[PDB]
Amino acid sequence: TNLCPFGEVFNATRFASVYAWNRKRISNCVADYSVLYNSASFSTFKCYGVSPTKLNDLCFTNVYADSFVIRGDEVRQIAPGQTGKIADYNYKLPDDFTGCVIAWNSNNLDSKVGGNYNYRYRLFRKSNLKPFERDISTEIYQAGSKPCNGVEGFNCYFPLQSYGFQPTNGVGYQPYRVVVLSFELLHAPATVCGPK
Amino acid sequence: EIVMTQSPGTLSLSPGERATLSCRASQSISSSYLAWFQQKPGQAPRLLIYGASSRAPGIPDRFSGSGSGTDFTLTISRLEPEDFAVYYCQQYGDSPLTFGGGTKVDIKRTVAAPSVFIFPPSDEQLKSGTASVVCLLNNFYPREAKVQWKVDNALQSGNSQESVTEQDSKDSTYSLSSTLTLSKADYEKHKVYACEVTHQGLSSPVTKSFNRGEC
Amino acid sequence: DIQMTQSPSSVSASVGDRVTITCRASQGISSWLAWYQQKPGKAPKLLIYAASSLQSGVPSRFSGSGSGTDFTLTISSLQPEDFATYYCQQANSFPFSFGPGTKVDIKRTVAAPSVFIFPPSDEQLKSGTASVVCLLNNFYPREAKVQWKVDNALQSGNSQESVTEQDSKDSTYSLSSTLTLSKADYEKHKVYACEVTHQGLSSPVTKSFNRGEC
Amino acid sequence: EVQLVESGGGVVQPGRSLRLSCAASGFTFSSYAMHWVRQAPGKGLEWVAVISFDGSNKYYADSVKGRFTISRDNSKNTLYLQMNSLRAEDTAVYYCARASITTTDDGMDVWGQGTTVTVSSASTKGPSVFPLAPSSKSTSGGTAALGCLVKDYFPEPVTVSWNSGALTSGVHTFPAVLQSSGLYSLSSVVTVPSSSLGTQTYICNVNHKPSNTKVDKKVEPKSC
Amino acid sequence: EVQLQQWGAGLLKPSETLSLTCAVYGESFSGYYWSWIRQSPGKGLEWIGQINHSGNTNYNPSLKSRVTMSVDTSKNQFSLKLSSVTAADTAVYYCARELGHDYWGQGTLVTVSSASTKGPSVFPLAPSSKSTSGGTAALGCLVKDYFPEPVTVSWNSGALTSGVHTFPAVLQSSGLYSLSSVVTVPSSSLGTQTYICNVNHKPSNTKVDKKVEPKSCDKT
C-alpha cells in the first residue's frame, strides 16, 4: 500500500534540459524497483554501490530522482569519475555515490523536423561544477581581453547551445532520457522501504 | 565528433579574381558558430570570420561569410598576394572543437610543358650497396602530373617516391623529382630504364630512356 | 486530465474593433497553448503556438500572450474573414484537451423576432402523430427562449429547437421550436401556445391555437 | 502540395467495429507524427489519439482507451484508426492532423476536410413531408409565413428547393435534429406578401440520395 | 596584447613521453582557459585539451587516456604530457588561449623516430649528351641516408641561386632521410665552368664540398 510515484518521473511527457535537471524527492513510500530492471526499454540500467536485484529489501532515508535529456554519446559521462561537458559544466555525480542510473531512447517524443531547439546544454563555463549543482545563469562567456557588458560579440559568447534533435539522426546523436536515483541515507529512520 | 569537410580541396586563381570556399558539416551546427581561419607558411593560424558572418578586427572588408546548418561559405571578392594561403573552418558550438582539412589557394598561369630529365646512378652508390635513379620535371603547370618507371618494358610499383617543390615566386611553376630505388643486383641484372611522364600540357606522354653502362 | 476552459462563452463585435479572448486551465502549463480557428463547414486553421509565437501565412493582427494558468488571444483590427470559432489546446501532458469554444458574432441593432405559429396539419394525424411549431425569424441577438404551454399550462420534455446561423444579408437569425406529441394526448386539450422571450422584445408575445381553430 | 484525405465514413450499428484510413501526399510521412481528432454534431473539437513517426509510441484519450487502436503504414503512406465497440456517443466528424513533433511542441499545421461517422441501428428510410400552411394569426403588415416540414428520414443529407430552386428571398431551412425515435427532421419556412396567397403557387421540392427519393409538395391555405 | 613562448623536447623515441611548456607574458593568467592544438599533414588542425588556473581540464575523448596537463600560476606556465608516443604524434604543437580566435603561440615541431644521429652521403647526378634541352642541361646532387633534419645545400659556395630547385625530404624505410638538389645551366658552360654541391649537416658537424663533372666515358 502507498506505492512510490515512479510514473510521474519515468512515464512523464516532457523532461527537462540537462542544465536544468528536474529533481524530485521521494519518502514515506513502498517503492517497488523490480518493475524497473525487469524490462527491456531501459537500454542503460547501471547501479553503483547497490545491486539491482537486491533493491526490494533495503530501506533508505529518502530518494532523489533527477530527470533530464541528453545525447546518446553523452551517457557514458553519467558516472562517478568521468569528464566532459555533462559531468563538468552540467550534472556532476560525486565519487563513490550510492544509487542507480537509468537511460532509454526517446527519439519518438523528443524529435522534430527542423530540429528541436528547446533542449539545451551548457557549453562554456569558467570553472567546473561541484557535485549536485545547478547553474541556470545565462550570463555571457568572456574569452578575450575585452569586457562583454552583457552584449554578445567577438570572443564573448553564449554558453547555452541547443541540441539539434531530428528523427533522422542515427543512433549517437539521438535523444536519450535519463533518470538518476540517489539513495540518501541518514541517521533518521528509514521512511522508504521495499515491498514484502 | 562533428566532422567537417572542406570543398574543394584546392583552387587556382589570379589577383583580382574572386574566391569561394565551402565547409559542410556532418550534422547541423549551433546558432551560427563557425569560424574561418587563415594560415600561411610557418606562421600560426589567424581568425578572419566568426559567427559565419562577422568580420573580426583587422580584417579587410573583402572577406565575407554566409551559410547555416550543414553548409557554410567563405568568399573573397578581390584577391591579393597576401590572400593565397590555407583556409580552415572551425566549429565552437559543440564540444570538442573540430577543424577542417583545408583549402589551398594557388596562383594560376598558362599551362607549361615540363622539362624532363633522367639520371643514371654513380659507382659510389653502388659500392655502397644500392642504386637510385632520378627523374626530374621542371617548370610545369598545373601540378597534376603522373610519372611511371619502366624496367626494360616492364612497369614497377612500391619503390618510386616523388617530392614536389612549392609554387615559385617569379613564374609560379612547379618542380618534381621521382626516385626509384633498386639493389645493385636487381639494377645490374636488367638492361634498360625509362621514365614516362604524363601531364595536361603534354601533347602525349614523354618517355626518356637510358640503358645500364650506357655511354 | 487537465481541463481547459475559455471565456467569454460568446462575443459580438464589429470590423476594426479590438477583440480579446481568455483561456484558463486547472494546472500549470508553462507555455504550451495553441489557438485554432474553425469556420462552419470547414476544418481548423492553426494560428498561435507556444502562446506567443505565430504560424507562417498568418496576418499580424493575431496576437497571443500569457503563461501559467492564464492565456489570452487578441485581434487588433477584425476583418470579415475572422468571424469564426476559436479553440485552445494544451500540450503539457497526456491526454491533451481542447476548449469548449468561443464564438465571434457580428454586431447590429437589436431587432425583433417576427413571431409566427404553425399547427399540426392533417397528414401528421393521419399517420398518428402531431407536430406544432412556433417561429422567431429576422431577430438579434442570438439569445431567446420559446416557452410552450398546452391548455395554458407549461409543458416540457417533448420540444426541440433549431437555429440556422448568422444570416449573411443583414446579421439576422431564425429559430424554430417544434412540439411533438401523440394524437391521443393531443386531442385531449385545445389551447396550445408558444411564448417568446427576447431582449429587444418590448414584452413577451404569446401566440396560441385552439384544437380545431380553423 | 500537402494534402491529407480521410475515408471510412458511413453508417454503422453499435457494438460493431470500423476502420478509418487517412492518405497523405506532399511530404515525408515517415517523419511527422499524426493525430486523430473528432468533432461531434453541434459541439466542439475533441482529441482522440496520437501516434509517432515509427509506431512505437501511441496515446489515446480516457474515453477511447481499449476501444480504439491507432496505427500507420509508411509504405503506402497511410494512417489507420480501428474503432471497436462503437456507441451512439461517437457519431462525429473525424479529422487527421499533422504534427512536426510528438507532444505538439509547435502545434498541428495540416488538417483534412474530415469524414463523417453516423452510429445508429436504424435503416434507410424515405422522408415524410407535411405542409405548414399560413394562418390568420400569422398576418402581420401583409406578411405571411409558410413552409414545409421533413420528418422521420434517415440518413443524412437532404436537399430542398422552393419553386424549383427559384424562391431564395427568405428561405430559412434549418438544420437536422436527432429525435429519440432515431431518425431526423427539419422545417423549411419562407415569408411572402400576404396578398399573393391565392394567386401564386409555392411548392417545396425534396431530394434524398440514399433512397433516390424525389418529392414535390404544395402549400395552400387551411381552408375551412 | 599577449605573448606566448613555447619550449619542449623535439626529437624523441617511441614508448617515451612528450613534454611541452608554454609561458604567458602580457595579461592575466587567471580567468581564461589555455589550450593545446596540434597540426599534422594528413590530419589537419586537431584539438587536444585545455586547462584552467585551478587544474580543471577539458580533454579530447580521442586522447583522454594519454594526455595530461599541468599549470603553475607562480611562473604563469602551462604544460602538456603525451604518453606512449609513436610516429603518428609527429607534428607541430601550438599553445593558444581559449578558442584561439585571439592569440596563438609560434609552434613547436615535435618529431618521433627510433633512429639516431647520422651523416649524409652525397652522390652526383651528372648530365650526358642526351640531356640537351635546346642548349640547356640539368644536373645536381643527391643527399641520402641522413638524420635528423635539416640539411643545408648551396652551389659554388653560394654563388648560384637561379634554376636551383631544392626539394623537400623523404622518410625512407630505414628511418633516415633523403633529398635531391639540382641546377639548370646552358650547355656552353658544362665542360668549361665548374659546379659544386656544398652540403652542411650541423647535428653531425659535416661540411661536404662535392665536385660535379660529366660522366666522361673512359674508352676501354
Nearest CB neighbour to D224, from listed C49, C133, C214? C214
Tell me which of C72, C106, C140 is where a domain ends. Answer: C106
Q: Examine the domain organization and report whether D14 and D87 are in the same domain.
A: yes
CB E215 to CB B215 under 8 A? yes
If residue D146 lies in a helix (H) or strand (E), which one and from where to where? strand D143-153
Question: What range defines the domain where residue C134 resides?
Answer: 114-210
Set of cell numbers at residue A177: 532520457
Q: Examine the domain organization and report whether B87 and B172 are in the same domain.
A: no
Please, which chains are in contact with C (at least 3 CB pairs closer than 8 A)?
A, D
Q: Examine the domain organization and report whether D10 and D98 are in the same domain.
A: yes
A13 touches chain C (CB under 8 A): yes
For residue E115, is it within any domain? no
Q: Examine the domain organization and report whether E104 and E9 are in the same domain.
A: yes
Instruction: Residue D208: give its domain's CATH number.
Output: 2.60.40.10
Residue C37 β-bridge partners: C45, C86
Q: List, in order, residues 6 or more apart from A70 with CB less than 8 Å away.
A: A18, A78, A86, A121, A175, A176, A178
SS3 A99: strand
Tell me which of C83, C106, C129 is where a domain ends. Answer: C106
Query: How many Cβ atoms are within 10 Å of D135's Cβ, its own excluded?
Result: 20
| Nearest to C101, CA basis, from D91, D46, D103 | D46
Distance CA C124, CA C185 (A): 14
Q: Examine the domain organization and report whether C125 and C149 are in the same domain.
A: yes
If residue C183 lies in a helix (H) or strand (E), which one and from where to where? helix C183-186
Asked if the bond preceding E120 is cis, omega within 30° of 0, the reply is: no
Q: Examine the domain organization and report whether D136 and D215 are in the same domain.
A: yes
Q: Domains in chain A and their CATH numbers?
A: 18-122+162-184 (3.30.70.1840)
SS3 C175: strand
Q: Examine the domain organization and report whether C162 and C74 are in the same domain.
A: no
Torsional class of C101: left (φ above 0), alpha (ψ -120 to 50), beta (otherwise):
left
Residue showing cell 653531425 = E204
Question: What range defines the domain where residue D201 resides?
Answer: 128-219
Q: How many CB pairs under 8 A join B and E?
A: 104
Query: Which backbone phi and psi does C86 adopt, to 5 degrees?
Result: -120, 125
Query: Which backbone phi and psi does A89 adopt, to 5 degrees?
Result: -95, 10
Q: Examine the domain organization and report whether B88 and B32 are in the same domain.
A: yes
Nearest CA-CA distance, residue A116 and chain D, Å: 9
Distance CA C144, CA C149 (A): 17
Q: Examine the domain organization and report whether D8 and D76 are in the same domain.
A: yes
Q: List, in order, residues 6 or more apart from B133 with CB less than 8 Å away.
A: B118, B119, B120, B121, B149, B179, B180, B182, B193
Chain A residues closer than 8 Å to B48 by CB: none
Q: Examine the domain organization and report whether D19 and D69 are in the same domain.
A: yes
Distance CA D31, CA A172 (A): 18
Q: How many CA atoms lie within 13 A of B146 on its CB side?
A: 5
Secondary structure letter of residue A20 according to DSSP = G
Q: Examine the domain organization and report whether E162 and E90 are in the same domain.
A: no
- Sheet order of strands, C5-7 included: C5-7, C19-29, C62-75
Q: How many CB pairs under 8 A join A and B?
A: 27
Q: Examine the domain organization and report whether D115 and D132 are in the same domain.
A: no
Q: Examine the domain organization and report whether C17 and C96 are in the same domain.
A: yes
Going by their DSSP bridges, the two strands C102-106 and C10-13 should be labelled as parallel
C192 touches chain D (CB under 8 A): no
CB A161 to CB B27 under 8 A? no
CB A109 to CB D32 under 8 A? no
Domain count of the fold of chain E: 2
Burial of A164 (0-12, 13-18, 19+ CB in 10 A): buried
Chain A residues closer than 8 Å to E99 by CB: 143, 155, 157
Nearest CA-CA distance, residue B55 and chain A, Å: 9
Distance CA A120, CA A108 (A): 18
Q: Examine the domain organization and report whether B135 and B181 are in the same domain.
A: yes
Set of cell numbers at residue E37: 592544438
Burial of A15-39, coded b for 16+ CB within 10 Å and e otherwise, reads bebbbebeeeebeebebebeebeee
Q: Examine the domain organization and report whether C99 and C120 are in the same domain.
A: no
Q: Examine the domain organization and report whether E46 and E138 are in the same domain.
A: no
| Nearest to E171, CA basis, from E95, E102, E108, E114 | E114
Q: Examine the domain organization and report whether D111 and D141 are in the same domain.
A: no
If residue B125 lies in a helix (H) or strand (E), which one and from where to where? helix B123-128
Residue showing cell 563538468 = A88
Distance CA B21, CA C24 (A): 54
Q: Examine the domain organization and report whether C154 and C178 are in the same domain.
A: yes
SS3 D152: strand
Q: Examine the domain organization and report whether B78 and B153 are in the same domain.
A: no
For residue E64, is it within any domain? yes
Distance CA A140, CA C165 (A): 58
CB A10 within 8 A of CB A26: no
Chain C residues closer than 8 Å to A13 by CB: 92-94
Query: How many Cβ atoms are within 10 Å of E176's Cβ, its own excluded?
Result: 19
Residues of A with CB under 8 A from a CB of D: 13-14, 107-109, 111-114, 116, 118, 167-168
Chain B residues closer than 8 Å to A161 by CB: 30-31, 33, 93-94
Distance CA A184, CA A170 (A): 37
Burial of E144-165, coded b for 16+ CB within 10 Å and e otherwise, reads bbbbbeebebbbeeeeeeeeeb
Q: Examine the domain organization and report whether E95 and E139 are in the same domain.
A: no
Chain E residues closer than 8 Å to B163 by CB: 167-170, 179-180
Q: Examine the domain organization and report whether C176 and C129 are in the same domain.
A: yes
For residue D224, is it within any domain? no
Q: Examine the domain organization and report whether D74 and D28 are in the same domain.
A: yes
Instruction: Residue B139: give its domain's CATH number.
Output: 2.60.40.10
Q: Examine the domain organization and report whether B145 and B62 are in the same domain.
A: no
Please, which chains are in contact with A (at least 3 CB pairs closer than 8 A)?
B, C, D, E
Q: Examine the domain organization and report whether B22 and B82 are in the same domain.
A: yes
CB A143 to CB E56 under 8 A? no
For residue D15, is it within any domain? yes
CB C89 to CB D131 under 8 A? no
- Sheet order of strands, C153-154 included: C153-154, C145-150, C191-197, C205-210
Q: List, in order, residues 6 or more apart from B117 with CB less than 8 Å away.
A: B135, B136, B138, B208, E127, E131, E133, E138
Tell me which of E79, E110, E141 is where a domain ends. Answer: E110
Tell me which of D96, D119, D142 is where a domain ends. Answer: D119
Indicate which technique resolved this structure.
cryo-EM
Domain count of the fold of chain C: 2
Nearest CB neighbour to A145, from listed E27, E59, E64? E27
Nearest CB neighbour to A161, from listed B27, B30, B54? B30
Distance CA C194, CA E40 (A): 97
Residue C207 β-bridge partners: C194
Residues of C with CB under 8 A from a CB of A: 92-94
Query: How many Cβ atoms are within 10 Å of E15's Cβ, its own excluded?
Result: 10
